[PDB]
Amino acid sequence: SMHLICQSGDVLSARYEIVDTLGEGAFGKVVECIDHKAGGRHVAVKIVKNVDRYCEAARSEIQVLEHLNTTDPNSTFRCVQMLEWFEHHGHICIVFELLGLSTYDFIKENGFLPFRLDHIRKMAYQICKSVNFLHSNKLTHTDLKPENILFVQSDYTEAYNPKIKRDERTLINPDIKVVDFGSATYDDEHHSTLVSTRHYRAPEVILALGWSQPCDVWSIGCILIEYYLGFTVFPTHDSKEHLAMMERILGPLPKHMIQKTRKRKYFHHDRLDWDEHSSAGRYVSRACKPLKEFMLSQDVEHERLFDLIQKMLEYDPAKRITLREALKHPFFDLLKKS
Numbered sequence: 001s002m003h004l005i006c007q008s009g010d011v012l013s014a015r016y017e018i019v020d021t022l023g024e025g026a027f028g029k030v031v032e033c034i035d036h037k038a039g040g041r042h043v044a045v046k047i048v049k050n051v052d053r054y055c056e057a058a059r060s061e062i063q064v065l066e067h068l069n070t071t072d073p074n075s076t077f078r079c080v081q082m083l084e085w086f087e088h089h090g091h092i093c094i095v096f097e098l099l100g101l102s103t104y105d106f107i108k109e110n111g112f113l114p115f116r117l118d119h120i121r122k123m124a125y126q127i128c129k130s131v132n133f134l135h136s137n138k139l140t141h142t143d144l145k146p147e148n149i150l151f152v153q154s155d156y157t158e159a160y161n162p163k164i165k166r167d168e169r170t171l172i173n174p175d176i177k178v179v180d181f182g183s184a185t186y187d188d189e190h191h192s193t194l195v196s197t198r199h200y201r202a203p204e205v206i207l208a209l210g211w212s213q214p215c216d217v218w219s220i221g222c223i224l225i226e227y228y229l230g231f232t233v234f235p236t237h238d239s240k241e242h243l244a245m246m247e248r249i250l251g252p253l254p255k256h257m258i259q260k261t262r263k264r265k266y267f268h269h270d271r272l273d274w275d276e277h278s279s280a281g282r283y284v285s286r287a288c289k290p291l292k293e294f295m296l297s298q299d300v301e302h303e304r305l306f307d308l309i310q311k312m313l314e315y316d317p318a319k320r321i322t323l324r325e326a327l328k329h330p331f332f333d334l335l336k337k338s
């Protein structure tokens with residue numbers, strides 16, 4: 001029924017007039033509205049599908065953001081500001097400060113070109129700071145990805161780039177915020193070993209070994225390579241294929257993780273049950289290669305980023321870098337200058 005209530009001109013809750021759709025997802029829709037009771041200020045309204053799983057996720061997000069916005073009222077740690085919620089013809093709607101495009105959408109609109117490295121450095125720093133603030137308050141996000149990082153302002157300048165024979169957009173201000181707190185889980189809540197639709201998903205989640213804060217660090221590792229390359233390094237929707245891709249980029253999985261997993265289907269003896277010479281197997285060999293071979297330059301700033309990424313993509317969550325540590329990494333020295 002959503003198409004009947006999310007059109008340009010519709011009014012929600014006797015105050016918000018829909019201008020246009022900003023984007024869609026599995027959850028529903030985000031629309032830009034005029035708030036007729038706050039002087040015409042533009043806001044963003046998430047309209048949530050009338051489906052039990054998303055309604056429960058939306059109620060959860062509301063609890064989480066209430067706690068985070070009162071703990072950090074000035075958005076020092078860059079979590080999105082929720083302004084209120086209401087119900088409209090059986091759909092939960094949540095009102096946010098209006099931001100710019102998602103980082104995914106910016107890449108897409110720019111023809112799948114990567115961000116340049118000085119912007120990557122700022123964005124990475126801000127993402128690590130924001131999610132470490134979550135990790136300090138006994139939370140894990142669990143669903144970090146480029147669609148869920150948004151530019152405060154997505155405005156750009158435009159010129160012809162003769163090095164790659166095409167026009168190129170250059171961001172003016174790379175400041176970001178983190179969104180989507182519907183899967184966010186407290187340390188003391190139930191940690192469901194089941195997880196749903198994502199491929200920023202850590203190896204401990206795939207193998208059902210239990211998870212906590214480190215799973216976020218793995219996701220951030222994936223985001224940073226994507227910003228550097230302009231495309232995903234794990235393009236797959238099959239778990240076993242995903243594990244095969246990991247092995248090609250990062251080497252074989254630790255033996256103690258293979259012995260512990262209850263998911264025996266993926267393994268024969270203590271090896272991944274993967275035919276290298278199948279149709280899908282040859283696609284993996286051709287798309288994926290060892291991590292450092294993705295580097296586009298041997299310059300030391302590039303090597304610094306890739307050392308950070310590698311520590312984030314440690315298989316064993318007990319050994320993986322924490323965000324506290326990552327904020328001190330040399331890659332970020334260039335921001336602290338004086």
Ligand SMILES: Cn1cc(-c2ccc3occ(-c4cccc(C5CCC5)c4)c3n2)cn1
Pocket residue numbers: 022023024025029030044046080096097098099100101102105147150179180
């Ligand atoms: C899942 N979620 C998003 C928000 C959110 C909050 C405020 C926002 O101000 C603008 C957007 C926006 C702009 C362009 C594209 C999109 C995309 C549609 C999903 C991301 C959003 C936006 N999204 C809160 N939860």
